[PDB]
């Protein structure tokens, strides 16, 4: 189980970092307006 929690933390990380990139891209698009 600790190994599974670590893997789930990694999948969460991964998803949050994709979120940061899409947010940064929003922010860049808004800036071109």
């Amino acid at each position: 189980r600790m190994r599974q929690i670590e893997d789930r933390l990694e999948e969460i990380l991964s998803k949050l970092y994709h979120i940061c990139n899409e947010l940064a891209r929003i922010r860049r698009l808004l800036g071109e307006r």
Copy 2:
């Protein structure tokens, strides 16, 4: 389009509320060890 950004934000939000739920479950798993 601004409509595209707003949907993107709402999809980010869906995803974040899910990540948060997942993190709350991890905490709770950790607490039940």
Copy 3:
């Protein structure tokens, strides 16, 4: 230490949920434009 990790997970949760609210508020502001 497991008790400290749980508390840090809670402070992270707390911060992420504030983020969701500010994002939702952005999304609402954009929508009024």
Copy 4:
């Protein structure tokens, strides 16, 4: 103002990259138990 939203987004991002760093450290703490 759109300038206000963009700064808000950049502050969200700062915070999220920090949360992510914190989560990566938790994983690593978990892995070193």
